[PDB]
RNA sequence: GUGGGAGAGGGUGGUGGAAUUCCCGGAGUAGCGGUGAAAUGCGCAGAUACCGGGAGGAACGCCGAUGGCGAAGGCAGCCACCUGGUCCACCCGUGACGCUGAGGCGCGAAAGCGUGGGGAGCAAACCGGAUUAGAUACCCGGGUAGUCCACGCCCUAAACGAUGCGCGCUAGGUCUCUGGGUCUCCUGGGGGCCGAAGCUAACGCGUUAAGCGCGCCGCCUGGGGAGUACGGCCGCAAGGC
């Protein structure tokens, strides 16, 4: 399976307003994806998590979602 | 006396009981059933067969209301949490989609001693 | 907090000669600056205990440096103490 | 004076009089607290991920400013007191940490 | 000193969503809950389930790790402000200014105390239902203090790495966090795992020493009696030394 960073450009991990790329790092639900599927380093993941929470509080990223086909 | 022709179906399954509430596309309920609505009384209500019978009874009451297309919402976990959906699929109601909306907190409340 | 403007102001004020950075005089001056900053931070925020431990350590270091200065040259020690208003 | 980024999400349904009024009130708040406005980006209508104040959409504003530090919280409060302003997040500016460089 | 860096380090104020409970409303019948079975309990004054709205308290899912920070206790949503510690590079400044530390002083999980707030959920005591030869327990239903906050006390612990602090010396390999570098790698500084020499009663330790040395502090001298008695000190008390 493909990791998120493998298929992506040279993007800003500190931009909480870019929903297009931050949506890639969320799961089918609103959960943040683990490093196994994001292909990020520890520092990169640590920054991404905080930017994702920032975007969430601004109503740009979903706090949680609903699972399908279950 | 409603002629709803379409709606939602919520399956609340626990380890002590499984209940099915068939509702309309904007949230209000139409009919419902459970393991106690049907004959079973005690722990018998938590078996998958009771969940199947409850789903089928609720689906037939929906037929009495005139239900054809059904969207499924699932909350909880227990024996027959899947058997309810299986019977609901083979009940004669065209299943639109299945959704698991089990409410999980963000670590808000302190559980009972059983749950720690 | 303490930006480079204030820091360099104090350093150029307490230098033994142009270019000096780590003289005992300059060390005690910068120490006393951070001491006063923290002690004013601890006038409010009486429940900040870890910063209070940091203040204890800063006091200890400043006192050690002043003891050394007093042991080596008493006159420069008096000058420093009078210039900073300590002890 | 440090560099900050003010995000403002307010009611989308406003017309031009109301929107210009709220925007000029934000401007007056920035003036009164010593906020030098370096740049501005107005996104406007956007689809929220979750409903905010019973509304599925919101109107967005982003201001990069330079203002004194001890006034940031009071400025945030004064910005929040307005009814139509539903979200205020003041963020200290930072450098663009990149990935997959 | 300069210039960079990582962080649930601390304090203050703000702020977000999920969930529980409760209240208002809509729609909707006959049970829900709970257990190994059950019963107390709740439900026709309309519950449970579903939908919308409101209130309030407490805690922060995914990220999260075998991770990080702190002297220890301990510290996880987000934002801002105040502030501590620490690491690296530059080789710039002072010129032994160092190490330890009886006493003292400060900090010190939880529970507990006092005054005043707060109170969703949980829950000693307690009230019931079961189980049993009996049930004063485990299991179920309730439920107060408390848990939360402000301020002042309390000074205990498996307060654990059961390993005091500092420095130097003594094979490496592997995983990792964070810096620098001419960036298959090297070089620092933290977190683990194997294992040289050596150590150990053995288990095991092994550049994060329990190895080889040095300095300083604390403590030990058979078990029970007993962390008891007396005395002193501290404490509102419980009680602690
Ligand atoms: Mg049952
Ligand atoms: Mg507002
Ligand atoms: Mg912190
Ligand atoms: Mg903090
Ligand atoms: Mg009602
Ligand atoms: Mg009744
Ligand atoms: Mg009754
Ligand atoms: Mg009654
Ligand atoms: Mg209340
Ligand atoms: Mg986890
Ligand atoms: Mg700092
Ligand atoms: Mg030199
Ligand atoms: Mg010289
Ligand atoms: Mg010492
Ligand atoms: Mg001592
Ligand atoms: Mg204590
Ligand atoms: Mg306590
Ligand atoms: Mg109390
Ligand atoms: Mg309870
Ligand atoms: Mg109980
Ligand atoms: Mg009995
Ligand atoms: Mg020793
Ligand atoms: Mg590198
Ligand atoms: Mg450490
Ligand atoms: Mg190492
Ligand atoms: Mg050997
Ligand atoms: Mg070993
Ligand atoms: Mg050693
Ligand atoms: Mg030994
Ligand atoms: Mg003793
Ligand atoms: Mg004896
Ligand atoms: Mg005792
Ligand atoms: Mg005696
Ligand atoms: Mg006594
Ligand atoms: Mg007395
Ligand atoms: Mg005792």
Swiss-Prot record, chain A:
GO annotations of cellular component type: ribonucleoprotein complex; ribosome
What keywords are assigned to this protein?
Ribonucleoprotein, Ribosomal protein, RNA-binding, rRNA-binding
Say which domain of life the source belongs to: Bacteria
One BP annotation, GO: translation
Q: How does this protein assemble?
A: Part of the 30S ribosomal subunit. Forms a tight heterodimer with protein bS6, also interacts with protein uS11. Binds to the C-terminus of IF3 and to the central section of Era.
The UniProt family comment states: Belongs to the bacterial ribosomal protein bS18 family.
What protein name applies here?
Answer: Small ribosomal subunit protein bS18
Origin organism is: Thermus thermophilus (strain ATCC 27634 / DSM 579 / HB8)
Taxonomically, what lineage is the organism? Bacteria, Thermotogati, Deinococcota, Deinococci, Thermales
- What gene name does this entry carry? rpsR
Swiss-Prot record, chain B:
Q: Positions of the region Disordered?
A: 99-116
Species of the source: Thermus thermophilus (strain ATCC 27634 / DSM 579 / HB8)
Q: Which gene encodes it?
A: rpsK
Single GO molecular function? rRNA binding
> Which SUPFAM superfamilies does the record associate with it?
Translational machinery components
Q: Which UniProt keywords apply?
A: Ribonucleoprotein, Ribosomal protein, RNA-binding, rRNA-binding
The source's superkingdom equals Bacteria
Protein name, please? Small ribosomal subunit protein uS11
Provide the Gene Ontology terms for cellular component: ribonucleoprotein complex; ribosome
Indicate yes or no for the key word Ribonucleoprotein. Answer: yes
| Family per record | Belongs to the universal ribosomal protein uS11 family.
Swiss-Prot record, chain C:
Name a GO CC annotation attached to this entry. Answer: cytosolic small ribosomal subunit
Phosphoprotein among keywords: no
Report the Pfam families cross-referenced here: Ribosomal_S15 (PF00312)
Q: Which UniProt keywords apply?
A: Ribonucleoprotein, Ribosomal protein, RNA-binding, rRNA-binding
Q: Name one GO biological process term.
A: translation
The GO terms this record gives for MF are:
rRNA binding; structural constituent of ribosome
Per its UniProt record, what NCBIfam families does this chain match? S15_bact (TIGR00952)
Q: Give the UniProt family note.
A: Belongs to the universal ribosomal protein uS15 family.
Main role? One of the primary rRNA binding proteins, it binds directly to 16S rRNA where it helps nucleate assembly of the platform of the 30S subunit by binding and bridging several RNA helices of the 16S rRNA. Forms an intersubunit bridge (bridge B4) with the 23S rRNA of the 50S subunit in the ribosome.
> Subunit info?
Part of the 30S ribosomal subunit. Forms a bridge to the 50S subunit in the 70S ribosome, contacting the 23S rRNA.
Protein name, per record: Small ribosomal subunit protein uS15
| Organism, as annotated | Thermus thermophilus (strain ATCC 27634 / DSM 579 / HB8)
Curated annotation (Swiss-Prot), chain D:
Species per Swiss-Prot/TrEMBL record: Thermus thermophilus (strain ATCC 27634 / DSM 579 / HB8)
**Is RNA-binding one of the keywords UniProt gives this record?**
yes
What name is this protein filed under? Small ribosomal subunit protein bS6
Organism superkingdom: Bacteria
Role: Located on the outer edge of the platform on the body of the 30S subunit.
- GO MF assignments: small ribosomal subunit rRNA binding; structural constituent of ribosome
Q: Which gene encodes it?
A: rpsF
- List the GO terms this entry assigns under cellular component, sorted alphabetically: cytoplasm; ribonucleoprotein complex; ribosome
Quaternary structure annotation from Swiss-Prot or TrEMBL: Part of the 30S ribosomal subunit. Forms a tight heterodimer with protein bS18. May make transient contacts with protein uL2 of the 50S subunit during translation.
NCBIfam families linked:
S6 (TIGR00166)
Q: Does the keyword RNA-binding apply?
A: yes
């Amino acid at each position: 399976k493909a990791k998120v960073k493998a298929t992506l450009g040279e993007f800003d991990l500190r931009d909480y307003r870019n929903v297009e790329v931050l949506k890639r790092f969320l799961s089918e639900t609103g959960k943040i994806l683990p490093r196994r599927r994001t292909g990020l380093s520890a520092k990169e993941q640590r920054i991404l998590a905080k930017t994702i929470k920032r975007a969430r509080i601004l109503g740009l990223l979903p706090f949680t979602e609903k699972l399908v086909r279950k | 006396k409603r002629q709803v022709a379409s709606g939602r179906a919520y399956i609340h399954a626990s380890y002590n009981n499984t209940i099915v509430t068939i509702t309309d596309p904007d949230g209000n309920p139409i009919t419902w059933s459970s393991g106690g609505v049907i004959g079973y009384k005690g722990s018998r209500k938590g078996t998958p067969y009771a969940a199947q019978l409850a789903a089928l009874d609720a689906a037939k009451k929906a037929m009495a209301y005139g239900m054809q297309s059904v969207d499924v919402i699932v909350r909880g976990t227990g024996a027959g949490r899947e058997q309810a959906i299986r019977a609901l699929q083979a009940s004669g109601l065209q299943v639109k989609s299945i959704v698991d909306d089990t409410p999980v907190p963000h670590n808000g409340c302190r559980p009972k001693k059983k749950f720690r | 907090p303490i930006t480079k403007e204030e820091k360099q102001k104090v350093i150029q004020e307490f230098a033994r000669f142009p270019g000096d950075t780590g003289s005992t005089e300059v060390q005690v001056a910068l120490l006393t600056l951070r001491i006063n900053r923290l002690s004013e931070h601890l006038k409010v925020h009486k429940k900040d205990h870890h910063s209070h431990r940091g203040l204890l350590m800063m006091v200890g270091q400043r006192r050690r440096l002043l003891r050394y200065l007093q042991r080596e040259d008493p006159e420069r020690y008096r000058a420093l103490i009078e210039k900073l208003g300590i002890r | 004076m440090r560099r900050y980024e003010v995000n403002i999400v307010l009611n989308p349904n406003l017309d031009q009089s109301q929107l210009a009024l709220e925007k000029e009130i934000i401007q007056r708040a920035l003036e009164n607290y010593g906020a030098r406005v370096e740049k501005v980006e107005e996104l406007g209508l956007r689809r929220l991920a979750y409903p905010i104040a019973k509304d599925p959409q919101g109107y967005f504003l982003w201001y990069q400013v330079e203002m004194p530090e001890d006034r940031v919280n009071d400025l945030a409060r004064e910005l929040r007191i307005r009814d139509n302003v539903r979200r205020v997040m003041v963020v200290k500016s930072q450098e663009p940490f990149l990935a997959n460089a």
